[PDB]
Amino acid sequence: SEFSQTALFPSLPRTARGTAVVLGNTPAGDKIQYCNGTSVYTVPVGSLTDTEIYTEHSHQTTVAKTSPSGYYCASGDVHGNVRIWDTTQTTHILKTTIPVFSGPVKDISWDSESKRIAAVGEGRERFGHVFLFDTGTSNGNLTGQARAMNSVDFKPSRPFRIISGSDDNTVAIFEGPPFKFKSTFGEHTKFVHSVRYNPDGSLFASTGGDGTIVLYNGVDGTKTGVFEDDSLKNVAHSGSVFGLTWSPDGTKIASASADKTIKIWNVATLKVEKTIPVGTRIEDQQLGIIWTKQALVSISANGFINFVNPELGSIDQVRYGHNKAITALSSSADGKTLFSADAEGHINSWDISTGISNRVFPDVHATMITGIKTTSKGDLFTVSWDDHLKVVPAGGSGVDSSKAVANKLSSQPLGLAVSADGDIAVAACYKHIAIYSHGKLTEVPISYNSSCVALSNDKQFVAVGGQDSKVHVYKLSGASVSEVKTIVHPAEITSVAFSNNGAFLVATDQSRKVIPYSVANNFELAHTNSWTFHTAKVACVSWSPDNVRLATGSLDNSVIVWNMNKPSDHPIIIKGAHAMSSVNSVIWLNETTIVSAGQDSNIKFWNVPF
């Protein structure tokens, strides 16, 4: 009512080296599903801003699958929980939730009728469970394999069957309902990571650590062939195969491997038609893959989403982003570009209007970036816990990190402020106020530990928040500072910002207070009202271009919009702006538009009318 979300640049899937990423998809195949944090993402192969998120799991999400009917989605987590919910409405009403076993769910499978669900993983009491979706009633017994079950799939045609892959190196097949163990197959010599039936259920294939792909008769599970690459010796891949998927017509199979390639195989000839190399880096290993009626997607170890053109044997599109906590944002002066930085030093550029992303490479930092700022000349200023302040030139690749000027800092940078043109940059460090201008770094030692910084638009003031529960305001001339005000807070300062017109300075502290000061009144309190609505640490603050409204992001998952003109009015509270996640950064793109980023790797845009 008082606000609405206009867009989302979604988190990439969570990844773990040498671990499979299982994807789900909608009936039309127009959208895929994957997980990060405690959420389930439904990403369209069409849009880049209309992804949908479902965040009701209380534990780290592992896999999510939408029913053939398309009305429901069954998602599991590391604790063995499987939630079944409506995907059609913004309410996502829970139909059923059930703890299938004590341990992480690794894969889930809906049956053709959308009446049954099979879940496999690492339980103490069992590695798999099959039950009716609406009632939660057991539909059989998946006992049979000795170790964790990594993959599971229903035979889409009658007579119904269920196949599974396990860490015991075996493939198992069950018949029913009620489902019961039928047989085990031992073609594989290492962990089985993926087992899948073709669209008509006449056949299914398996693959895993041994790098081989075996083909089987869908009803009895008798081996009918193996896919081998003529360029290799009796194997399909030169390393572990984390997943395989069938083309819509069932004539081809695509596999994703640790050998950094995606291969398209012809089912009839059992030969590889095309090998699609992603790159030479360990980040290029392929950990998951899925072929829908509208797209073939493969996931890199770095989280990137690769759209494959099976016909041309090439990568059509690649979506970048983040799967680790976003820690800083900056938007271009012209409002067309947004830069985002994360806890692991990765930076992405985004076209604000389209959502198209670009990953800065090589990385500007190998660790935690606590500040980033773009300037009117394309330069990109950054500070990181590798104790450096770097300036990266622009649009030649867009940001040739390869030509960034690095400057070692004396102490850890916790905040960054840079003038519009990049003439002056100031970094609040643990034991210094670092100033960079005209290619020279000057570091003023301070007797307190700073926590944040803000530079006034006219470049005359520098406000430094401190762990001494004080806001130190200085008049700046070159790298020479003169303190003109020391503002006392009841707790440690967490963030600061000057309004564009320089009329106000706002500071937030660990007591959860948000306090603005009148610069014209020598930094005296602008109002007596207590703006203490956040129920958790305030992590960031930013002013609207109107110099009246401001916004704060907090560890309590919300963004709050404050109004300097009506201090006693209740503020606008976007509750759960970033569900189960802290809002680390916020910026006003215009008088009624805010962009937020959180620990959840999500970047959200909000419209907040006057």
UniProtKB/Swiss-Prot annotation:
Predominant location: cytoplasm
GO biological process terms, semicolon-separated: actin filament depolymerization; locomotion; muscle thin filament assembly; negative regulation of actin filament polymerization; positive regulation of actin filament depolymerization; regulation of locomotion; sarcomere organization; skeletal muscle thin filament assembly
Keywords: Actin-binding, Cytoplasm, Cytoskeleton, Repeat, WD repeat
Organism domain of life: Eukaryota
Pfam families with a match to the protein in the record: WD40
InterPro entries: G-protein_beta_WD-40_rep (IPR020472), WD40/YVTN_repeat-like_dom_sf (IPR015943), WD40_repeat_CS (IPR019775), WD40_repeat_dom_sf (IPR036322), WD40_rpt (IPR001680)
Subcellular location as annotated: Cytoplasm, Cytoskeleton
WD repeat copies, ranges: 56-95, 144-184, 187-226, 236-275, 321-360, 445-484, 488-527, 533-572, 578-609
GO molecular function: actin binding; actin filament binding
This protein's GO CC annotations: cortical actin cytoskeleton; myofibril; sarcoplasm
Role according to the record: Induces disassembly of actin filaments in conjunction with ADF/cofilin family proteins. Regulator of actin organization in myofibrils.
Homology family: Belongs to the WD repeat AIP1 family.
Protein's name according to its UniProt entry: Actin-interacting protein 1
Organism expressing this protein natively: Caenorhabditis elegans
Native organism taxonomy: Eukaryota, Metazoa, Ecdysozoa, Nematoda, Chromadorea
Designated gene of the protein: unc-78
